[PDB]
Design a binder for these strands. Structure first.
Ligand SMILES: [Ca+2]
Ligand SMILES: [Ca+2]
Ligand code: NA
Lengths: 161, 163
DNA sequence: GCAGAAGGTCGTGAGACCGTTCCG
DNA sequence: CGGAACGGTCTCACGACCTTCTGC
């Protein structure tokens, strides 16, 4: 149901007030790999503009979580997970300009995830993509993400790899 | 030569990192009315991303002015004036959402401008709209623009208007 | 005499995560 | 569980003008 100019407008707005990011969440309750990869895209806007986010929510099939207020007078719409992202990103990729690379990296992670879930070596290759995505969202002179270096170290220390 | 999805993308990017505004520029060298209504739409982005603005610039027929650095590590692309905006806005209005009204108000000012030039009373009506566009760019709790009130008082004390 | 190009900047509105709780 | 939804927030990257230099 997503028409071309709708996907295009959204990619434009996403390249503007939005974000495409990936991160590593520590999970104590997990087993061999005490980490969960989170992937997401989000739109941020001052709360009085909430309806506009709502509109994008409907155009995207009502996937995601909306917040009238994050707690600081700002509203957002966050779409987390491969389930939602595997459907949405393909529609926005052809129009994404500034954050096009980040989007393609999420997609790659989604591709690799199933087989990386419980394979230390694979999980690492997947974490390196998380670093790249995070680094793409930084200025050149900022300290680069180092999740791969830290996890490789941990995995060795734990005799997992 | 602007394609629909190109225009839609631009409208979305403009709604995000862009700005559509109007203002009054005092002009010491003007005749009857010493003010100029400056109209514009602009895109802003961090320095290192300047080439993305360049792309939009090319897509909008190279109209407007680019700045690799405003002076604070931020780059921008500003499209100023009726000539350029009367051509570009009509192309983006179909897809603008957040700043749609600001866009239609600039368009309205462009329609009225010709006859408001050397006409104090009409120039004020026009300035009322300049305040509206400016108010549309504020939070509801902020102090509204006062271009109309101050200009009227000036016109009155200058003998340019009688009521 | 008129106006677009180019300069400058304060007050945020965003971005890009990190944290904690819920749930089928 | 293995996400899914809810919370929270530092650090800027914007926005939306205002000011001044150019050009004819
Ligand atoms: Ca931005
Ligand atoms: Ca914005
Ligand atoms: Na923005």
């Amino acid at each position: 149901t997503l028409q071309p100019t709708e996907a295009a407008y959204i990619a434009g707005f996403l390249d503007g007030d939005g974000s495409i990011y990936a991160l590593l969440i520590p999970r104590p309750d997990y087993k061999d790999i005490k980490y969960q990869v989170s992937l997401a895209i989000s739109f941020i806007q001052r709360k009085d503009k909430f309806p506009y986010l709502q509109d994008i929510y409907d155009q995207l099939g009502k996937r995601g979580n909306l917040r009238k207020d994050r707690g600081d007078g700002i509203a957002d719409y966050r779409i987390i997970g491969s389930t939602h992202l595997s459907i949405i990103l393909p529609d926005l990729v052809p129009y994404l300009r500034i954050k096009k690379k980040q989007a393609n990296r999420i997609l790659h992670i989604i591709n690799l995830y199933p087989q990386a879930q419980k394979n230390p070596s694979k999980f690492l290759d997947l974490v390196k993509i998380v670093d790249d995505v995070q680094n793409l969202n930084k200025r050149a002179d900022e300290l680069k993400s180092t999740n791969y270096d830290r996890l490789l170290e941990e995995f060795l220390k734990a005799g997992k790899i």
